[model samples]
Structure formats: structure tokens, C-alpha cells
Target: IVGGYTCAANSIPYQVSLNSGSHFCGGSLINSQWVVSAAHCYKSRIQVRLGEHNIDVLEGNEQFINAAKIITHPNFNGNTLDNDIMLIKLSSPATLNSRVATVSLPRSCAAAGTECLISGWGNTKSSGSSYPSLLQCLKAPVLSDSSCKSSYPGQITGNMICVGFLEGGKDSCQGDSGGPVVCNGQLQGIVSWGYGCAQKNKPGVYTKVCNYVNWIQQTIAAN
Candidate 1:
């Protein structure tokens, strides 16, 4: 379980809970009112928890707030696994606190091979169960465009970013989807998919945050 923060705090980090069960991934506050996560984590009853740390709770001592709305990209294709992104609208604006803060979205596009951070409660082992309580983070360098194109061939669109460790132990796993891929204090990507968990030669892929800036702004404005 994660810790909790005060209600008046702003810039608080958010997380996604699946089916009233465990938190699968981490998310970032985009504005005072919205959270951004990967679309791959989309579920029928997704609950966005804000300002809390631990998963289990006592009676009622500052529990995390749940989101009112969950919006995923219209073009999301689960079968082909394309357009993997989503947004959560909080019931109310969060108050500012130390642990809760929005990370900036990348403005200038990142070049290939840029190092980035990926965090989540995904499985630690390659072919085993996922972690429940602890949050884990690791570093991965963005794959060069040419390399990515050659790897996946025609699927490497401009809307995606490839990241993974060549060493194979560290990676974004199944439950890690929808988490942030932070680069230089800015949000560069959201964990999407891969051939397998921590598989060699098949790096993890993410939805390029920068590519959807206009769409995100327009959607937020419309809402």
C-alpha cells in the first residue's frame, strides 16, 4: 500500500485501481483536475486513487479520492493495441501537497536513446506474479527510431516511443501499463505494451505523450 496526503494539496500523483482490487500502475496529475494514464490499463471499473500510499486502509483516516470519470482514447484498439492512452477526471480539484504534484509533459520531442524512468507495481520476476504493495522504478533508454522500426517493422508509428533495458531484468510489465515514462522531469510516454515481459530483443513500448498534446488539450477543453 502507498501513503496518503492532505486534501488541499495540489500536484499530487495518482494511481489506477483495477476491479476494486490492487493498484496496477502509477499515473500523473496533468492539471488541477485531471490525471493521465496508459490506455492499456483500461478496465470496466477503474478507480483512480489520489493522495494515498498503502493499499489497505483502517476505518477512515485520509483515504485517497476516487475519480468521477474515466476517458480513454476513442481509437483505442485492444486487439492491435494501438492508441493506448486515457484520462481520469477527479470529482474535485486536489489540494497541493508534497507527494502529490503534476509532472510536466514534454514540449520538445525527445530524440531516440533518451533515458527515462518507468515506475509501477508490476511483477518483479519475468514469468511470475505481480507485486502488490511496493512501488518499483527503473531506467530505460529510448530506442532509436530506426531500431524500433526495424524491430516491429510497420507498426512503429510516430505516436509511440520504445523503451527497455537491454539487460532484460528491468522492464514495464503487464500491470505496469498506463504508468508514466518520465524523462528529465517531463512526461514523455505512457507504458503501453511489448512482445513479452522483460523479453530480450522486444523492448517495451509507450504512447508518445507529446504526439497527443493537441488532442489532450482539446478534449480537456471540451469536457
Candidate 2:
């Protein structure tokens, strides 16, 4: 996240690292055995770490679980970033405690202009190189769907939501994919993709979580 600061360990207990040997993507612990992330971040073998804040630190609060099953949204379009959401079934259920929990899903759309928080271990700068070991966070305003489409033209879709500054400087950049875009203490969007890091007139795109509530429920129930 652009203009972010290191956050306290386990502050956002639901936050997790979706990895393949190392940190590859960010995810959320939606349940003891389920994780929600971006479809495009899928890897054959993934390690889901819950209650982790700093990547370099090995806090006892951390719980490592292998991904037993991967279910990307059937309609996911990696090219267009449409339906860019996925769920990971953990090989072992998470141990629920104060340091590990679940994030609530939104009942409806995130209200426009309501500022939300997104935390991840992404690049500090837009270009590259600086990957923070600590979990970083920033407050970003949720833009209206219409206002967001103005920036993306044809790229923005109903399956997606937009968050960023109109000018630039603050955004979820590379390596932040599959992370949470939380609003009103609920999970609103998943950081799926973006045009460029902190670019002017262009905001970061996210998979609209509210759009897939039924899909999530059905997938979990069947699987």
C-alpha cells in the first residue's frame, strides 16, 4: 500500500499470507478452514498463514495450514480481472483465538466515500524493490462505482470495486493482491488488480465481495 505504515501484530487478525514457499499474495481468514483471495493469485501448492503480521517474525500466534483445495470463481477472467475472487480450503482448521479470527462480509455495497482500511505486505514504492517485512496499512476512500469507471473506461465492471486517491500517491500496489479492502468492519473487496501503482487518474481495482456472496456460500456448502 502506498503511504502505508507498519501495523501492530494481529491487529487485523483475519489477515493472512497466501504463499507458495514464500509470500506470494495476501488473503483473509473467512473461516477456520476457508480463506478468501484473488483468483489470479492461485498456485498449485499454497501455504496459508493466519494471525501473522510480520513476515520475518515467528510469533506463536501464527498458524500455518496447507491449502487442501483451491476454488477459483468459475467465471474468473484473469485477462479482464472479471470475477477475480477465490476461496482456499485449509488442510487443517484455524485455531480461533483473539489473535486469529474472521472478517465479516458486507450485507450490501460499500457506501461511496466511506473511508476503509487495506493492509498488506506489498511494495512501499510504486516501481519495485521495497517489500516491507511488516504488515503495512493505509486508509483509502471508497469511490463510487460511477466515479471509478471514469478512471478505468471499459476496465471497471460490476464484479469490481475501486479504491484510491483521485490525485495519486496512495494505493495497493504489486504483491498486495488477494488482500482485504475492509469497510465498516466488514470485508468489502479483495485487491485483485490495478493499472499501475499509485498512478494519477487511475485507481486500484478490487473484486467486489458483495457480488459473490451466493457463489461463496454455494461453493463452501458443496465443497
Candidate 3:
């Protein structure tokens, strides 16, 4: 994450890394076997690593498991970036511990201006390439719908929420897609997209998790 600090080890237990051979996206464990991430992060042969702190180091607390099923939101639109949420069923259940646990999903939409915590292993710069081994985190406030819509013009949608400073300093960047945006200890957003990393008037956009709580639960229960 651009303009963020290295997160304390094992503090954000629900945070996970979605990997093929390396970390490509971030995700949150919502239950023992289900992970919620951005639909655009879809890939074959994904391995979900729980209890991860540093990607470069084998931390010992890590539990790497394969994905048994991946269900992207049926209404997800690639062009518009609407409904960009995905559910991943783990091949095996994660063992909950102090360093590996689940996060609760939001029951209602977070209010505009609600400060939240966003953590990820995305790019640390607006341009070029720079990635950290340790997970990074930043505090960002949710932007009002009107403000968000104005920033992105015709691109903003009801399923998305904008978070970060409008003037731009900290934000979720490339490689951070599908990460968690937590407010009050609940999973509220999933890092989805943006025009550029930490640019003026270009706050990071996230999939509003409150709107999809029912869909997530139903999918997990029926599957």
C-alpha cells in the first residue's frame, strides 16, 4: 500500500494472500473455509495462505491451502467494474488460532467519512514497480457517494465505495486488489480499482461488502 506502514505481525489475522506462485492479490477469510476477494482477481490454481505476515519469509504460522471453488458475482461486469466481489471456498478448513481467524462481514453500509483500516501488500508507489514483503496498512476515510461519483465521473456505481484522501497520499494500489477494508472490525470493502495509485482526486475504490452479505452467506451455505 502506498504511504502506509508495515503492519504488526499477526495483528490482522483474517488478512490473507492469494497466490499462484507469488502474492498477486489480497483477501480476507470470512469463515473457516470461505474467503471474500475481488472478482477480477480470479485465476486458476489459486492457493490461499492464511496467517501470513511476510510473504518472503516462511513465518511458520502460515497455512497454505488450495481453492476448492471460486464463485464470482454473476452480475460482475468487467467493463464497468460493477459487482466485483468473489467468494472462494477453501479446499480444506483453516484452523482458527490467535494468528489465523475469520472476520465478520458488515451488516449495513458504512457511513460516509467513517474511518477504516486498509491493509495489503500492493505497490508502494503510484508509478513503476515497488512491492514490500511485509503487509502494509493505512487509515482511510470513506468518501460520500456524491464526492466519489464526482471523482470518477460516470465510472462510480452503487456497489462501490471510495476510501482515502481526496487530495491523495495513501491508497491501495496494484497487487493489492481483493484486499480487505475493515471498519469496526468487520469486513466492509474489498480493494477493487482506481485510476492511479495515490493520485489527487483518485481515492481507491472498493466493493461495498454490506450490499453482498446475503449473497456471500447464501453461496457458502448452499455450496
Candidate 4:
């Protein structure tokens, strides 16, 4: 979360930490027992921590649930990071409350210029170590497909959405992958990949989740 601020407690109820023993990536609770994340963050064992903030502290609001099933996109490409999405079925359903809830799925694609919110406990600095214990957030705008292609030429695909300033300064960094890009209170994107964190002429690339809506529903239904 480069160039971001600490988010208010419980402000991001759908946010969760995908962990083994410690936070490795961020995810969003899409339902009581379903979570959305990046395939790149996959591990043999994952404990999903919900209602988390200031992760270093023993927050009573937190709920730790193991993954009952892990499903990564069948065609997920590690090299180009296409279809970088994944789903996790929690061992048990999360108890929805003021501090724990699900994020809504998008009804339509996130248009360019739409303002969105990204939150995570990732590196604040591009170079040095600055991972925060408290969750951080930033308001960023969606970059048009063409503008995104101009930045990375030939790399931007229809399945990817770009967010951030071309001049850099703010972005989702390490440990932020699989986190939500919330626009209009809907899950529009998933932090996927990018050039060096917050570097000039580089905007953070995210999985264009709108394209995967059907897949997500089908996966959840079949599983």
C-alpha cells in the first residue's frame, strides 16, 4: 500500500489475510464461506483470517478459518499471470457481523476514471522494508485499457485492469496480491502484478474480475 493511510478499524469487513502462520497475501470474503484471491498466492495450507486489523495484535474480532477447498483457475498462467484468480472454501462459514461481512460482486465492468478503493497490509515503501501491521488504503482511479496498454505495451490483456497513476507514487505492493479493488462497493478487480512497486510509468495491474463473474459463480456452485 504505497502512499496510503491506515484504514479505520472494521471499515473493510470483507478484507482477510491469507496465511499459514503469518499474513502472506490479502483476500476478500465474497460469501460466508467463500473467499477470492490470486492464484499466485496459493499454498498447500492456508488459514483465512477475517475481521483483521493491526494484525500484530490479538484482535478478538478476528476469525481464523482453514481452507476446506482450494480452487485456482484452470488456465492460470504463472508467466503472464493471466487468469490469476482463485477461490477458497472456508472450513466453516464466517459469522457475519459488524466486523465481518462479504463484499458484493460487480454487476458490470469498472469503467475508466472510476474511483476505487484498495486496502492491504503490504509494503508502504517501494525499496525498503515497510510492511504495516495496520491495514492501509488508497483511493485510485481506473486507467483505460488503451492507456494501460501504452504503459506496458503488449502486456495489458483484456483480462487485466490497470489502476494507479502513470507517474507512480501509490500502489498495491508485495503481500497485497489477491486483495480487492472495490468500486461502487463491488469487487471489480484483484491485485495481480506490476513492474517494481510504485515505479514511474507503471500502474498496478489487476485481474479484471468482471470477466470472471460467470466462472466464479459456476465454480462456487459446482464445488
Residue 28, model 3: lDDT of 97
Q: What TM-score does model 3 achieve against the real structure?
A: 0.98
TM-scores for candidates 1 onward, in order = 0.84, 0.97, 0.98, 0.98
Off by over 4 Å in 4: none
Runs of candidate 2 with Cα error greater than 4 angstroms are: none
Candidate 2's TM-score reads 0.97
Q: How far off is residue 192 in model 2, in Å?
A: 1.0
lDDT of 1 by residue, 173-212 (tens): 7766777788878788887877777766677778989888
Error of 2 at 125 (Å): 1.1
lDDT of 1: 0.68
- Clashes counted in candidate 2 amount to 0
For residue 118, model 2's alpha carbon misses the true position, in angstroms, by 0.5
Sort the candidates on TM-score, descending order: 4, 3, 2, 1
lDDT of 3 by residue, 1-223 (tens): 9989999999999999999989999999999999999999999679999999999999799999999999999999999989999999999999999999999999789999998999989999767879999999999999999889999999988899999988887899988999999998889999999988899999999999999988998999999
Task: For candidate 4, write residues 79-188 as lDDT tens digits.
Answer: 98999999999999999999999999999998899999999988899889788999999999999898899988888878999998888889999999999999999999
Candidate 3 segments exceeding 4 Å error? none
C-alpha root-mean-square deviation, candidate 1: 4.8
Candidate 2 structure quality by residue, lDDT tens digits, 120-164:
988888665688888999899889899899998899988888987
